[PDB]
């Protein structure tokens, strides 16, 4: 279960293609290790800018989480933490809990969605009740479902980065989700529309009976939300997505979570988790355009948040490219001249069985439709979270080294740094 570690110091953001010719895993380390009691999970990377990254995480205090594996449960804290490296990810600060560290269920918040473009980094997150499934009937618990959201703003992202962040503030869904819907969050970067402002909010729905009873019959509702220092939800985007009966236990739906992959200001596009009872084993592919189009694709998946990067003219694999231009024009820095277009392309990360082995993948960039490799980058994980940095080098974070030994989902979290000709070759023809 254990990874192969490496930790290399290295110049921060690189500058030529001498110097990144012949690199490969840049940083492949535990940025969090053991922990005690506490669970770090679900975490969710961005580049800020420069050799700045942020790592945003939720932190269950002194307990694993709900039974099916959500941080709130309208009773225990649980935290939203960040990390920043000045130096590409060579040393990150320590983790530091969001608006002081969590104490009660009034002020729990998990599963963060990260926005960002350039100056202001917005975290949404589960708070109350999320999609926890208890002992009690939904209709009956008092931490109901809420939405909470905390907006960092940050500063000197062109030198060594630093945030602040505001105080967390309730996200009403009043007049938008109905009283009994359950809702929440799941975990991962959100989308922002062309326009740089517009953010396209996922509210994840479930009917979850209780211990006992249990259903988990899921779906989900797209809202947009302008970016400012006080959100608030917007129109709706297409129809309310509501996942059908699966072939397993009575009551859980083929598919789980959906989370976005594009949006094209008209529809929502988005990839669903199979149901690990009753599903296919397969991601699921739908939009917005109706209550239920999802179709089975080829890619292989399980439970967890999914890692997706889309590169507009700005992936070179194998070919040379110069970094420094990069920083600057991310589409025209190819060649050994350094100014040829790059073209599109996505990566993809998920395990493929429950807490199994992580797989990254090339998806072709208009039908997500995945290439024959895969790139194992974990014995064991659940979620990953991919971006790339101004010199083209591709950042991951991820869950890994599951502790089996720890009584629920336990793992470390992992920095990973790749060159996209190391890639390419373990993904490309
Ligand atoms: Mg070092
Ligand atoms: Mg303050």
Redesign the pocket.
């Known amino acids: 279960n254990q990874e192969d570690e490496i930790?290399?110091?290295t110049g921060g953001l690189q500058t030529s293609w001498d110097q990144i010719k012949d690199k490969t895993i840049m940083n492949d380390y535990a940025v969090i290790g053991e922990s005690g009691g506490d669970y770090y999970r679900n975490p969710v990377i961005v580049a800020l800018g420069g050799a700045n990254v942020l790592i945003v995480t939720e932190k269950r205090i002194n307990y694993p989480g709900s039974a099916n594996d959500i941080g709130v449960n309208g009773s225990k804290p649980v935290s939203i933490v960040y990390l920043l490296s000045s130096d590409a990810g060579?040393?990150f600060s320590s983790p530091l809990p969001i608006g002081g560290e969590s104490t009660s269920a009034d002020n729990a918040v998990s599963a963060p969605v990260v926005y960002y473009k350039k100056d202001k980094v917005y975290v949404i997150a589960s708070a109350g009740a999320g999609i926890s499934r208890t002992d009690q009937d939904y209709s009956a618990r008092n931490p109901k479902s809420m939405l909470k959201y905390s907006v960092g703003t940050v500063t000197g992202a062109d030198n060594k980065a630093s945030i602040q962040w505001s105080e967390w503030k309730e996200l009403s869904v009043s007049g938008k989700i109905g009283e009994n819907v359950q809702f929440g969050t799941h975990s991962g970067r959100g989308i922002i529309a062309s326009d740089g402002t517009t953010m396209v909010l996922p509210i994840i729905t479930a009917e979850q009976g209780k211990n006992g009873a249990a259903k988990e019959m899921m779906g989900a509702e797209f809202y947009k939300v302008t970016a400012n220092d006080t959100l608030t939800i917007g129109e709706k985007i297409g129809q309310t997505v509501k996942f059908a009966q699966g072939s397993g236990t009575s009551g859980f739906s083929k598919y789980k979570e959906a989370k976005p992959i594009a949006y094209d200001n008209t529809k929502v596009t988005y990839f669903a988790v199979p149901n690990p009872d009753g599903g296919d084993g397969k991601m699921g592919k739908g939009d917005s355009g109706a209550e239920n189009n999802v179709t089975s694709t080829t890619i292989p998946g399980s439970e967890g948040s999914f890692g997706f990067l889309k590169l507009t003219g700005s992936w070179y694999g194998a070919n040379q490219y110069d970094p420094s231009k990069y920083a600057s024009n991310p589409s025209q820095a190819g060649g050994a001249t350094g100014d040829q277009a790059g073209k599109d392309e996505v990566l993809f990360s998920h395990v493929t069985t429950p807490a199994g082995q992580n797989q990254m993948r090339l998806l072709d960039p208009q039908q997500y439709e995945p290439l024959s490799k895969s790139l194992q980058i974990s014995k064991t994980s659940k979620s990953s979270s991919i971006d790339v940095l101004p010199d083209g080098t591709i950042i991951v974070v991820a869950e890994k080294e599951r502790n089996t030994g720890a009584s629920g989902l336990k793992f470390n979290i992992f920095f990973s740094r790749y060159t996209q000709s190391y890639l390419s070759s373990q993904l490309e023809y």
């Open positions: 930790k290399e110091n060579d040393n």
